[PDB]
RNA sequence: GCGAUCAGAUACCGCCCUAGUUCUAACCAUAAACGAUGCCAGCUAGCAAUUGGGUGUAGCUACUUUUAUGGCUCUCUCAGUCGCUUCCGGGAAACCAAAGCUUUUUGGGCUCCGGGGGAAGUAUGGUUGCAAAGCUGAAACUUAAAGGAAUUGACGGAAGGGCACC
């Protein structure tokens, strides 16, 4: 069915920038989308998210700014114990400076570079650019 | 874009849409400005001062480029219940 | 009996009637006198041909405006022709005919009361 | 626009041709009536869904006779198409 | 302030049958449809007609050469209508078989280049159209409900049928331009009568003697 | 090394000479579409070094059968943020070289530097990764660390020296024996460095009111003018 | 390469359809895969109609007709011609085309 | 086994016709068992068909005094199988609305299979089978190509036009 429904939301987000669009109903969000979502906020990536009770699962309308040239997800999310951030960082990210990768970190569903402030590794779920 | 001491260097910055945020690449010739000319208020008597709004090749491809001036013109004002 | 006249006795004669159209008559005895001395054509047998294939094209210019040969008088005299049909009349009253969601839509635009029927 | 939202907000027209499931908040085009039998003071309140071979208070008259989108009302009966 | 749909105007939109659209719809061009009649016919809103020919209108100006914007129809029914756009407002005239590179050959003799297309119809028009978003031209165009708004920036929605919307459009068009920077100025109407931009028409042509002399009988 | 008194077609051409435009960076931004090598040849073309890179001969059979055609394939560029790249069919050597050169001009495409982090000393590379394909192979730029100078294969080399790309890391795909594929797939890889909606470049501006409009009255008329 | 979208004949959620057998060759080919052309002819072809109508009794008559709806194998089809050898391009456009109007059906 | 054809016919072709086709109780487990395309979920394009259901029909027709009912169109919508034309992506192209989202060496979940061409679906052993066979399935050794595509020519006892008293 949907084992990780987080990848199903974020590549429907893709598939809308890909028409230009600038919005997409998102199906069945989680937490760990929510989480996501937020962390995508923060650096201004998309426009407002709104979370729409349905008594079923939660279903999502993302706002698009369109800053976004493609977000992928991490199942398996591989343990990182601190010094694999470097290396995964490097592959998928178009450059040093900038694009977030984003874990699943012991304090919350944070940035690469917030888990760095931190100091806390984790399991990885994203890449956003 | 800028170098050590404040200069900016590399050659240009492009302009983008004023719909999807999107540069124009500068051989995407399927790129369109439109100027369209403000009113000396009353009535006709038509003087300068362009509203001017650009729009990719990827909008008017997707066949929607006249729409995105209805929305944009209608932010400027001079349309009414678009 | 068979034949269309080749591009170098087609295409003098196209271009000839471009410059020259005015001097170029129906009549092939001046107009082979004219491809002479306008043009430096060799030999009598191809200088009568060109002249001669311009006579032909003259001949249908002269019935109704022939294409690909506009001396633009031709254009000058369409803004001349244009012929106004007078009186150009909304009919009968009006005329009122509605299709009637059309009139829906026309009262709440237009304060504007304009007849309408919502009509046979 | 191939930027064309607004579906936080979306359009009346639009969502009432769509479907029942296809909505931001999908919401049950299922609804509620009285039935009255002119014989009987009694009110029950049947489904045009219906779910039940509906037999009124004590009289097995028949009420409804269901069909597999809309049961039929059947004959004879006047309803309300409110929540009493 | 006048500038919004003047009513005078609108008796004229009305006779000249433009509220007619094409049938079948097409998503692009949901917008520019109110209503559905019934016998499928869609009615096209007037009001958003009429913004759209003040649009375009306005999109003619401010390229400061009038001439260097072409006018476009393949169609017989705007070639009379194309012409006399040219007649008015400077804008050069492209009439019929577009040759194509117009704008695509320096080597071609008809090497043209539009600051502006306005276009009749975009399914028979579809090569200048192509070739115009080949070399950066602004494309306005004349649009069925079927209409490819693809390479379109502004639709004026006539009703391309024929008759007598696209003639009246035309003139709608050209008449805006004379009264923004043409000098017509303070829009009170029009002493040259909109059934000039018309096709004149019949193939196989009744050859009738201009100079109105009733035609009573042999 | 002209020596042609160039006569404009178009109206753009008609900016270059009157030095109404002095940068092709214009023409880039209002993305105007250079017909002209005339253009070209003014602004940069003075400067620009043009290199063959390949000759490789092709077969085609006028009919009974066997004729031969050639092939050129050039890369022409500043060392400063330009290349144009054009391969051409032709019946001789020269004519196959000089037209090569001639469509290689009109593509001329404007090259994106960016930085390791460190903005010291003037962008040397690239900002990001940035990949494009033609026909099965592509060629994946990568930006690497100074004096790394330029890692990829002997004929890409020569493609990005044009360029002016101090340092880049490269990966190219494919069949590897197709040389020509090669080229034509590190000419989109270049081309897309713009392509990237990078977080620099988020915030618009007024924009621009096109040298095309503004000029315009002196572009349509009327000399054919001495000095 | 499948040059045929539809394989041979548009098969499309059947895939196996009861042959019929062809009669030309009376071979077997799924029913979706026979090219058919049915015969509509007079019983007493052309010239003889004007002979027959004189001879026999009843004010005018009005001919009774032949059906018969042949089903070919594509081998038998282009050996006698009813299927030429069509376009890598005109293999997709499926139109007809006649002009005329009376359909041949000869020998 | 016969008659022609053809050097041969043993074949196509023509005749007689056996096992077989069919059915029943058992085998076999394989086929282009093919839509050459795993399955389950979401998302990414217009139109008209097409299968079925449903919502409205103050639409036509069928009838009872008209109805109520039914079928079809018309309108709207799911889920089916496809087509057309365009990709708004992929591909080497042919094509593909999936062969898209297959990333910039990544994207939901999961299986199976390929990793030069032949030898070879053979050997060998195990297994299953009454048997025929089938599954599982090497290597020695051989060899620089092999395959798919499109392009242009050449060529047809593949197809349509023309042109000349060789």
């Excluded at chain 4, 004590?58 to 004879?76: N, Y």
């Excluded at chain 7, 895969?33 to 009794?57: G, H, L, P, Q, W």
């Excluded at chain 7, 890598?88 to 456009?93: G, P, S």
Aim: glycine share 6%; charged share 25%; net charge positive.
């Amino acid at each position: 069915v949907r084992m990780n429904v987080l990848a199903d939301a974020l590549k429907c987000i893709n598939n809308a920038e890909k028409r230009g669009k600038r919005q997409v109903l998102l199906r069945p969000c989680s937490k760990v989308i929510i989480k996501f979502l937020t962390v995508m906020m923060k650096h201004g990536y998309i426009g407002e998210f709104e979370i729409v009770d349905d008594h079923r699962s939660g279903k999502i309308v993302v706002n698009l700014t369109g800053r976004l040239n493609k977000c992928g997800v991490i199942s398996p999310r591989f343990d990182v114990p601190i010094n694999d951030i470097e290396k995964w960082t490097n592959n998928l990210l178009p450059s040093r400076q900038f694009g977030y990768v984003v874990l699943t970190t012991s304090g919350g569903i944070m940035d690469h570079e917030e888990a760095r402030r931190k100091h806390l590794g984790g399991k990885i779920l994203g890449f956003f650019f | 874009m800028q170098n050590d001491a404040g200069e900016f260097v590399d050659l240009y910055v492009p302009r983008k849409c004023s719909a999807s945020n999107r540069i124009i690449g500068a051989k995407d010739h399927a790129s369109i400005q439109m100027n369209v000319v403000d009113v000396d208020p009353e009535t006709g008597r038509q003087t300068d001062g362009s509203k001017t709004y650009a729009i990719c090749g990827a909008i008017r491809r997707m066949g929607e480029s006249d729409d995105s001036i209805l929305r944009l013109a209608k932010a400027d004002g001079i349309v009414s219940k678009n | 009996m068979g034949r269309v006249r080749t591009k170098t006795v087609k295409k003098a004669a196209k271009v000839i009637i471009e410059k020259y159209y005015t001097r170029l008559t129906l009549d092939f005895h001046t107009n082979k006198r004219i491809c002479e001395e306008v043009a430096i054509i060799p030999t009598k047998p191809l200088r009568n041909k060109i002249a001669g294939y311009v006579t032909h094209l003259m001949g249908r210019l002269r019935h109704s405006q022939v294409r690909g040969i506009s001396i633009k008088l031709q254009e000058e005299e369409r803004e001349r022709r244009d012929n106004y049909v007078p009186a150009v009349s909304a009919l009968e009253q009006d005329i009122i005919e509605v299709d009637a969601d059309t009139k829906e839509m026309l009262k709440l635009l237009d304060f504007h009361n304009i007849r309408g029927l919502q009509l046979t | 626009m191939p930027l064309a939202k607004d579906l936080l907000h979306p359009l009346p027209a639009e969502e009432k041709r769509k479907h029942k499931l296809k909505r931001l908040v999908q919401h049950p085009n299922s609804y509620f009536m009285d039935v009255k039998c002119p014989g009987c003071y009694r009110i029950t309140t049947v489904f045009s869904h219906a779910q039940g071979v509906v037999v009124c208070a004590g009289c097995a008259t028949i009420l409804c006779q269901p069909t597999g989108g809309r049961a039929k009302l059947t004959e004879g009966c006047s309803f309300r198409r409110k929540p009493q | 302030d006048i500038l919004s749909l003047k009513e005078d105007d609108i008796t004229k939109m009305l006779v000249a049958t433009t509220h007619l659209g094409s049938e079948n719809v097409n998503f692009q061009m949901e917008q520019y449809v109110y209503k559905r009649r019934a016998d499928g016919v869609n009615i096209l809103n007037l009001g958003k007609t009429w913004e759209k020919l003040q649009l375009a209108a306005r999109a003619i100006v401010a390229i400061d050469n009038p001439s260097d914007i072409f006018v476009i129809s393949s169609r017989p029914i705007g070639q009379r209508a194309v012409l006399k756009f040219a007649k008015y407002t400077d804008t050069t005239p492209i009439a019929g078989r577009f040759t194509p590179g117009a704008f695509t050959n320096q080597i071609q003799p008809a090497f043209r280049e539009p600051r502006l297309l306005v276009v009749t119809d975009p399914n028979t028009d579809h090569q200048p159209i192509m070739e115009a978003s080949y070399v950066n031209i602004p494309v306005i165009a004349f649009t069925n409900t079927d209409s490819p708004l693809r390479y379109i920036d502004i639709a004026i929605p006539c009703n391309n049928k024929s008759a007598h919307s696209i003639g009246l459009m035309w003139w709608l068009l050209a008449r805006e331009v004379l009264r923004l920077r043409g000098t017509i100025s303070r829009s009170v109407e029009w002493p040259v009568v909109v059934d000039l931009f018309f096709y004149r028409d019949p193939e196989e042509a009744e050859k009738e003697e201009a100079a109105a002399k009733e035609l009573l009988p042999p | 090394e002209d020596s042609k008194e160039w006569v404009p077609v178009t109206k753009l051409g008609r900016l270059v000479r009157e030095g109404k435009i002095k940068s092709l960076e214009e023409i880039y931004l209002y993305s105007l579409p250079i017909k002209e090598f005339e253009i070209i040849d003014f602004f940069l073309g003075s400067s620009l070094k043009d290199e063959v890179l390949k000759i490789m001969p092709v077969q085609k059979q006028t009919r009974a059968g066997q004729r031969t055609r050639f092939k050129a394939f050039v890369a022409i560029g500043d060392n400063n943020g330009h290349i144009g790249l054009g391969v051409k069919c032709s019946k001789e050597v020269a004519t196959a070289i000089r037209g090569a050169i001639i469509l290689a001009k009109l593509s001329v495409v404007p090259v994106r530097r960016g930085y390791w982090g460190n903005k010291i000393g003037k962008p040397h590379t690239v900002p990001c990764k940035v990949t494009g394909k033609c026909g099965s192979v592509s060629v994946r730029l990568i930006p690497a660390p100074r004096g790394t100078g330029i890692v990829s294969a002997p004929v890409p080399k020569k493609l990005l020296t044009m360029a002016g790309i101090e340092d880049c890391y490269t990966s190219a795909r494919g069949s590897t024996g197709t040389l020509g594929n090669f080229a034509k797939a590190t000419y989109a890889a270049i081309a897309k460095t713009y392509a990237y909606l990078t977080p620099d470049l988020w915030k618009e501006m007024p924009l621009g009111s096109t040298p095309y409009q503004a000029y315009s009255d002196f572009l349509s008329k009327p000399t054919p003018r001495l000095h | 390469t499948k040059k045929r979208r539809n394989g041979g004949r548009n098969k499309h959620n059947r895939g196996h359809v009861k042959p019929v057998r062809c009669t030309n060759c009376a071979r077997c080919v799924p029913k979706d895969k026979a090219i058919k052309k049915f015969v509509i002819r007079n019983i007493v072809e052309a010239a003889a109609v004007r002979d027959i109508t004189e001879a026999s009794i009843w004010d005018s008559y009005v001919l009774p007709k032949l059906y018969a709806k042949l089903h070919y194998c594509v081998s038998c089809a282009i050996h006698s011609k009813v299927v030429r050898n069509r376009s890598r391009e005109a293999r997709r456009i499926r139109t007809p085309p006649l002009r005329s109007f009376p359909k041949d059906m000869a020998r």
